[PDB]
């Protein structure tokens, strides 16, 4: 999961 | 029951990256779908464009606010999808990309  | 053109409410994790790399989808195409990780979450599935990987599918956790509310980062909230996808769409605003146009099919 990318995450800001 | 009539859901909106970028939700994919039993699209796994697998095949929204398939969906998004096909040809018709581009950078900025994305796309929602229930979550793979937790209870009633979803996830954002959104195609990126980088250097070495070339096209790419970047998955983001859309976290549930307690009674009601989503969120990508803890400093800014959405009373709902609508008002989530709407501002990412206007300004990245911390994502990889601004979200374009939904997943098609």
Same mark, same amino acid.
């Given at each position: 999961?990318?995450?800001? | 029951? +009539?859901?909106?053109?970028?939700?994919?409410?039993?699209?796994? !994790?697998?095949? $929204?990256?398939?969906?998004?790399? $096909?040809?018709?989808?581009?950078?900025?195409?994305?796309?929602?779908? +229930? /979550?793979?990780?937790? $209870?009633? /979450?979803?996830?954002?599935?959104? !195609?990126?464009?980088?250097?070495?990987?070339?096209?790419?599918?970047?998955? %983001?956790?859309?976290?549930?606010?307690?009674?009601?509310?989503? %969120?990508?980062?803890?400093?800014?909230?959405?009373?709902?999808?609508?008002?989530?996808?709407?501002? %990412?769409?206007? $300004?990245?605003?911390?994502? @990889?990309?601004?979200?374009? !146009?939904? @997943?098609?099919?």
């Amino acid at each position: 999961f990318e995450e800001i | 029951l +009539e859901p909106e053109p970028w939700f994919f409410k039993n699209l796994s !994790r697998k095949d $929204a990256e398939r969906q998004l790399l $096909a040809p018709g989808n581009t950078h900025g195409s994305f796309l929602i779908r +229930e /979550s793979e990780s937790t $209870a009633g /979450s979803f996830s954002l599935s959104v !195609r990126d464009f980088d250097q070495n990987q070339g096209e790419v599918v970047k998955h %983001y956790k859309i976290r549930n606010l307690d009674n009601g509310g989503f %969120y990508i980062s803890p400093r800014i909230t959405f009373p709902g999808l609508h008002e989530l996808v709407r501002h %990412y769409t206007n $300004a990245s605003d911390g994502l @990889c990309t601004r979200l374009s !146009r939904p @997943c098609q099919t």
